[PDB]
Design a protein around this ligand. Structure first.
Ligand SMILES: Cc1cc(N2CCNCC2)nc(C)n1
Ligand SMILES: Cc1cc(N2CCNCC2)nc(C)n1
Length: 460
């Protein structure tokens, strides 16, 4: 029974509007409706992992699990196993997987973050799940961010609190937040970003939706514009949106957008918006391909339509050699040449690096770099040829070329990370000096760059 090198992952996000679902929700898991939809010929083919995010979910975990498992069984004839379920208030995440994966999935972790203070603490935040799938780490975040067209900045703040404080994945990766801890990270939910057009244009927007002319609406989508200006979700991907706005509908039909201000909305307009989103971030040069991104047309119990996205995701096998795990493989080494970090910091402390990777027995601390002034004001930290030679646990190229090195640049004074990034070992050549590069972030914001050269020695 061979270990897979690809799996498919279903991501669902649905704000249920505090209403029980209708009796049939199979269209969601089949990626049928509007947008980038799944071919009919695939309907019986189960995804490897289904990750369901709900917001305003009125069901118990038991009630929702029963509905999900019965849905998937009807579609696939497979009885899925529950990997994890985690609920904060009415925000929920469920992970289901094919039974054949039960002994491929380990290190299952759940957490939540509550966003806001006093007034704004009580119903918004995020839940998440992480685990290993063979040699691949997977993380999943379902967030319900602050609502309202005039709160895009609050949403961006909610994003940064969630990526800082959600404690998923390997805690030995202490300098790294969730945006670096996983081979593949999927972040979805009712992100609540709106189409920022004047209230007076509501009927014009509705017209555009009826014509399936989304271009002039998406050009005003706050998540697309905030992402373009690097205010949120830096280094994440989103598939092109080709489905109608998923909010705000009159219930029991999809024929009407309910946008006008009401006491029940706090006298706020809800112009048709793409509130419900799926984004991802995978390590460099790992296979990840979005195969669907759309909304259902036939599930109408909520003022939101469910969103689906499916992905091909590259996975690696749990590698065993005669040497590693449990020793090094003398035949393997990673060398860094002519490396320098460029930092946006106004601080003058010395900096050192940490290299973290599953291909190492434990992380490696460098010597301090040499600070110089860059020509445009920047701090440049030069490492020269001073960086430690990394000793991977396995030298086999089939293993080593699939690995990644996380880099943190830390202050000598405070041991606080000023920047985090990631370097793929999927090189064009071994035993060859080759350029490497990663942006550096801290709390998910750009703080600099790391670049230089690598020379990778494998047993071939
Ligand atoms: C909690 C956790 C740990 C972990 N690792 C990788 C295997 N060895 C132990 C450390 N990986 C993930 C995704 N989560
Ligand atoms: C034009 C553009 C590109 C981008 N990328 C691309 C490669 N990795 C993820 C980040 N993100 C945005 C918001 N805009």
């Amino acid at each position: 029974q061979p270990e897979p090198d690809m799996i498919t992952i279903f991501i669902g996000t649905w704000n249920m509007g505090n209403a029980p679902p209708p009796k049939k929700i199979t269209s969601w898991f089949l990626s049928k409706g509007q947008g980038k939809t799944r071919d009919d010929s695939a309907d019986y083919i189960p995804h490897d992992i289904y990750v369901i995010g709900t917001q305003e979910d009125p069901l118990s975990e038991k009630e929702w699990l029963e509905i999900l498992k019965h849905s998937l069984q009807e579609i696939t004839s497979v009885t899925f196993k529950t990997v994890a379920i985690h609920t904060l208030w009415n925000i929920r995440i469920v992970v289901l997987a094919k039974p054949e994966h039960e002994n491929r999935i380990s290190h299952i972790c759940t957490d939540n973050v509550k966003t806001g203070i006093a007034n704004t603490l009580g119903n918004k935040g995020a839940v998440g799940v992480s685990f290993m799938f063979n040699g691949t780490s997977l993380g999943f975040v379902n967030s319900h961010l602050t609502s309202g067209s005039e709160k895009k900045l609050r949403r961006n703040q909610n994003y940064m609190n969630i990526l800082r404080f959600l404690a998923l994945g390997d805690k030995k990766l202490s300098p790294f937040n969730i945006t670096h801890r996983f081979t593949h990270l999927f972040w979805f939910g009712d992100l609540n970003y709106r189409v920022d057009l004047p209230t007076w244009e509501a009927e014009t927007i509705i017209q555009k939706i009826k014509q399936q002319q989304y271009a002039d609406l998406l050009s005003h989508d706050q998540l697309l514009t905030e992402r373009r200006e690097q205010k949120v979700f830096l280094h994440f991907e989103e598939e092109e949106i080709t489905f109608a706005p998923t909010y705000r509908f009159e219930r029991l039909t999809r024929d009407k957008y309910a946008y006008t201000k009401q006491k029940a909305t706090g006298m706020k307009y809800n112009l048709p918006s793409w509130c419900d989103r799926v984004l991802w971030k995978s390590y460099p040069l790992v296979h990840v391909v979005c195969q669907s991104y759309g909304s259902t047309s036939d599930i109408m119990t909520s003022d939101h339509s469910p969103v689906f996205a499916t992905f091909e995701a590259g996975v690696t096998s749990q590698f065993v050699s005669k040497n590693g795990p449990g020793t090094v493989d003398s035949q393997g080494q990673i060398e860094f040449l002519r490396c320098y970090a460029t930092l946006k910091t106004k601080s003058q402390t010395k900096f050192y690096l940490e290299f973290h990777s599953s291909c190492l027995e434990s992380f490696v601390k460098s010597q301090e770099g040499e600070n110089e002034e860059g020509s445009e004001g920047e701090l440049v930290v030069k490492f020269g040829e001073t960086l430690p030679k990394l000793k991977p646990i396995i030298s086999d190229p089939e293993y080593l070329l699939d690995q990644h090195i996380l880099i943190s640049i830390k202050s000598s004074d405070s041991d606080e990370s000023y920047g985090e990034g990631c370097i793929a070992l999927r090189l064009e050549a071994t035993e060859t000096q080759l350029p490497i590069y990663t942006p550096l972030t801290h709390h998910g914001e750009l703080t600099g760059h790391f670049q230089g050269e690598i020379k990778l020695q494998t047993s071939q």
